[PDB]
């Protein structure tokens, strides 16, 4: 069962997100109070890799979804049958994978031979000149509400920094809700947290 434990590690690995607010038409927004991303289906979700020191060439960055609730954590997170069969692949992603990376021709998609879990992995590259972080553009390809799939169960995304052999260098995670109205839902869930 995939670890979700924050592990900043020797390279001081953290995640950053944009400040996108809660307006009616927002497509991706991150709640620091909830450590939770709210986003629309198939829209660009920028995730920033911040490191205190640069990991070596050959380092890779893996993303994987798991169910947040203990009673569901052993079930593989997959797209629902409707979306698996709707012929919407970009030509790189297998149609069953929930998480895609856009804009990177070196992306690789893994179906674990033993656990059957899906993940998507790109080579780590240092920030561009002038930039302080490396940005990966993720897409989530089912709504949280998809009945044949996540069926309204919250998920976590786990981002792992790995060496070329798959050994752990660092780990971070965040909750995700994929929904029609991310701004509205972020505003609602943040108001609920204030009450509890």
């Amino acid at each position: 069962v995939p670890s979700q434990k924050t592990y900043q590690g020797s390279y001081g690995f953290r995640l950053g997100f944009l400040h996108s607010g809660t307006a009616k038409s927002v497509t991706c927004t991150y709640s620091p109070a909830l450590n939770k991303m709210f986003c629309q289906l198939a829209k660009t979700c920028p995730v920033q890799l911040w490191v205190d020191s640069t990991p070596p060439p050959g380092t890779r960055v893996r993303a994987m979804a798991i169910y947040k609730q203990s009673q569901h954590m052993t079930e593989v997170v997959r797209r629902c049958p409707h979306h698996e069969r709707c012929s919407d692949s970009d030509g790189l992603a297998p149609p069953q994978h929930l998480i895609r990376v856009e804009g990177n021709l070196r992306v690789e998609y893994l179906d674990d031979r033993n656990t059957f879990r899906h993940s998507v992995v790109v080579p780590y590259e240092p920030p561009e000149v002038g930039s302080d972080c490396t940005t990966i553009h993720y897409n989530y390809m089912c709504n949280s509400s998809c009945m044949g799939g996540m069926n309204r169960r919250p998920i976590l995304t786990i981002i792992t920094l790995e060496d070329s052999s798959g050994n752990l260098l660092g780990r971070n995670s965040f909750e995700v809700r994929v929904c029609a109205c991310p701004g509205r839902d972020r505003r609602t869930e943040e108001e609920n947290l204030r009450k509890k």
Binding site: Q8, G12, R14, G16, F17, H19, P32, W50, D52, D132
Partner: protein
């Protein structure tokens, strides 16, 4: 634990959340897994207003992380000029060496931050 929440609020730049946490006395001296304080994190990300409120609140301007860096080290490395200026005014130690033997000036030089290196040398 309000210290852990303040670390993450300072890192993500949530001014309103930082204000609420500090209004509840969240520990400004809390440290994350890398030994960074809220002041370190805001100095790294470039959140000037959060840096300033932490300095008004008894945060140790010269706290060191697990690699020996102070907040001024981070601001000098990344290139946050206004934060460098306010850290210096608050008593940041220009001579502090991290575990690579580097002062903030050295990190400014190493990262091509010319204007900050000039500021730091005049304050040496």
């Amino acid at each position: 634990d309000l210290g852990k929440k303040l670390l993450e609020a300072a890192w993500h730049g949530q001014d309103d959340e930082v204000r609420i946490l500090m209004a509840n006395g969240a520990d400004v001296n809390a440290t994350d897994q890398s030994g960074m304080t809220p002041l370190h994190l805001a100095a790294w990300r470039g959140h000037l207003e959060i840096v300033e409120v932490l300095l008004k609140t008894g945060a140790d301007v010269n706290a060191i992380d697990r690699w020996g860096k102070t907040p001024l080290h981070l601001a000098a490395r990344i290139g946050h000029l206004e934060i460098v200026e306010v850290l210096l005014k608050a008593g940041a130690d220009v001579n502090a060496q991290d575990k690579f033997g580097k002062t903030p000036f050295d990190l400014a030089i190493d990262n091509g931050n010319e204007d900050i290196a000039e500021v730091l040398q005049k304050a040496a």
